[PDB]
Amino acid sequence: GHMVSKTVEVAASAETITSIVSDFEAYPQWNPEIKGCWILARYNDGRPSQLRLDVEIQGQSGVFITAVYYPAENQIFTMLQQGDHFTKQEQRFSIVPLGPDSTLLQVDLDVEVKLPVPGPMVKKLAGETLEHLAKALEGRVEQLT
Amino acid sequence: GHMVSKTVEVAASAETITSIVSDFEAYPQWNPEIKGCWILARYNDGRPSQLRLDVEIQGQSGVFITAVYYPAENQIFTMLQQGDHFTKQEQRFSIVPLGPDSTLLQVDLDVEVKLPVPGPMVKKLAGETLEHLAKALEGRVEQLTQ
């Protein structure tokens, strides 16, 4: 079980969506499956380079220690360093402008689990995570608009 | 949250104690309340520079992210960067050889808790943690010695 992807159109500008995806410590305010987030380290330009995320994995609480990379202007790439449940979690956000106030958010999620869970079930659970993330982001956009 | 200290004489060489204390990922094997420990980053010489420590108490999990320093050749100094319940946790291990086969372990622990727990109560709990580690290290030494 491995890479799943989700594209969703959001009713906000590309810079607003990039700001939401980049405001990691505000994740618990609008994402139900992230209960806490702490910036552990920052690059020399101040951008967060390492995070702690308190997450809910199928209802279990879990802790992720994650590295953050910035491939391009409207792109964010996170890489799990050590976490509960998963041996690998690589997530790429790509923010593609549509119109002045509309944006395509494209999310790739790349996971490997510690327990020998069957392939289709891993991709189903990762797809559900992206489905919920998109709905949570929609709510955050409406709250700020 | 004033600093608490513990000195214990251990019946093992300095190289044995240094190896036990430095083997961070083996901590769960001899500490019952530590469920996991992972090296997150290393210095350029390979020595770990950052750790994740998972503790469990009454089935309740806690996670600590700590930086590791080597201030002197016989010293290991850890500084909590972010953890549950604590705003500060600075712990220093100093390993000094005594006789041909025993060594002195010096541990200082300086903690701050998030809740407004009174100072004297924090230091009492920190002192209990050090006894607790000292007894656990004693067991690990006996388990690892001939």
- Going from N- to C-terminal start, the domains of chain A cover 1-145
Chain A residues whose CB is inside 8 A of the B54 CB are 63
- A136 and A31 Cβ atoms separated by less than 8 Å: yes
Rounded Cα–Cα distance for residues A71 and A89 (Å)? 17
For residue A70, what are the CA distances in angstroms to A45, A65, B31, B114? 12, 17, 39, 33
**Shortest CA distance to B66 belongs to which of A48, A29, A52?**
A52
Please report, for residues A144, B21, B112, the alpha-carbon distance to residue B83 in angstroms, rounded to integers and kept in the order given.
Answer: 31, 21, 11
In angstroms, this model's resolution equals 2.0
The residue behind tokens 């309340």 is B33
Our CA-based measurement puts residue A68 at a distance from the nearest CA of chain B, in whole angstroms, of 14
Q: How was this structure determined?
A: X-ray
The shortest C-alpha distance from B96 to chain A (Å) reads 33
Are B80 and B60 in contact by the 8 Å Cβ rule? The answer is no
Contact yes or no for B93/B101 (Cβ under 8 A): no
Helix-helix angle B14-22:B119-144, to 10 degrees: 120
Residue A63's Cβ-side half-sphere holds a number of Cα atoms within 13 Å equal to 17
Residue A49: closest CA among A62, A40, A58: A40
Characterize A111-128 residue by residue with b for buried, 16 or more Cβ atoms within 10 angstroms of its Cβ, and e for exposed. Answer: bebeeeeeeeebbebbee
- The rounded distance, in Å, linking the Cα atoms of A25 and A41 is 13
Best of A24, A39, A52 to substitute, by most chain B Cβ atoms within 10 angstroms, is A52
Give the chain B residue whose CA is nearest to the CA of A66: B40
In which order are the strands placed within the sheet that holds A75-83?
A4-10, A103-113, A86-97, A75-83, A60-69, A48-57, A34-42
Please calculate the CA angle B1-B3-B9 and round it to the nearest 5 degrees: 140
Tell if the CB–CB gap between B65 and A81 is shorter than 8 Å.
Answer: no
